[PDB]
Assembly symmetry: C3
Homo-oligomer: 77 residues x 3
């Protein structure tokens, strides 16, 4: 009914292409840390499977680690 | 009875002033990533509305995106 | 039965040694932000007490702040 926080660690050489395909599927993600790049992206419940699948197609093999975390509340100001 | 993790994405030109006013209201936040600056701040349940309001007054219009996330446990060592 | 996300803020002069001893106890952590270094580390329920204890022995006194957060789902690709 509501949101999840995705936290993803992936290979930097997939950072470019993953980021590109997030954009194409209307996912708004933030680049957090590299060496391995960490992204976090707020996603609707409906669309977790969707973003998992995108991360999967563009990353891993390559490597990828993903956390789906609960969100109590979301505000845009 | 307990805590929340706030995760906030805001405009970098509001980073300076938001950070200042967090301090004034005894909020301890960490600067995480910029381009848009990401902050996270551990807050007590009681005080979520408070920190939302601060983020709101000093950021957005400007833009701001905020996640309130559950915390199982908190330790200071 | 499942996982937690640990989020830890500690002193940078303990960053070196904490990181070393995480590795020795098979904890996979990501370095996020410094000034104070922020780490996050995905941990199994079983092993929270374990990683708390490691953070504690190697950090704080020194200072350390730790969040244990719920994880709905975990995927490796
Ligand atoms: Cl990985
Ligand atoms: Cl924004
Ligand atoms: Cl600290």
């Amino acid at each position: 009914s509501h949101m999840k926080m995705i936290i993803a660690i992936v290979q930097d050489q997939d950072s470019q292409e993953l980021a590109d395909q997030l954009v194409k599927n209307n996912f708004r993600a933030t680049k957090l840390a590299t060496t391995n790049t960490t992204f976090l992206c707020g996603v609707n419940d409906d669309r977790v499977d969707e973003i998992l699948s995108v991360i999967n197609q563009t990353c891993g093999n390559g490597g990828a680690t993903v956390f789906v975390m609960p969100v109590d509340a979301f505000h845009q100001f």
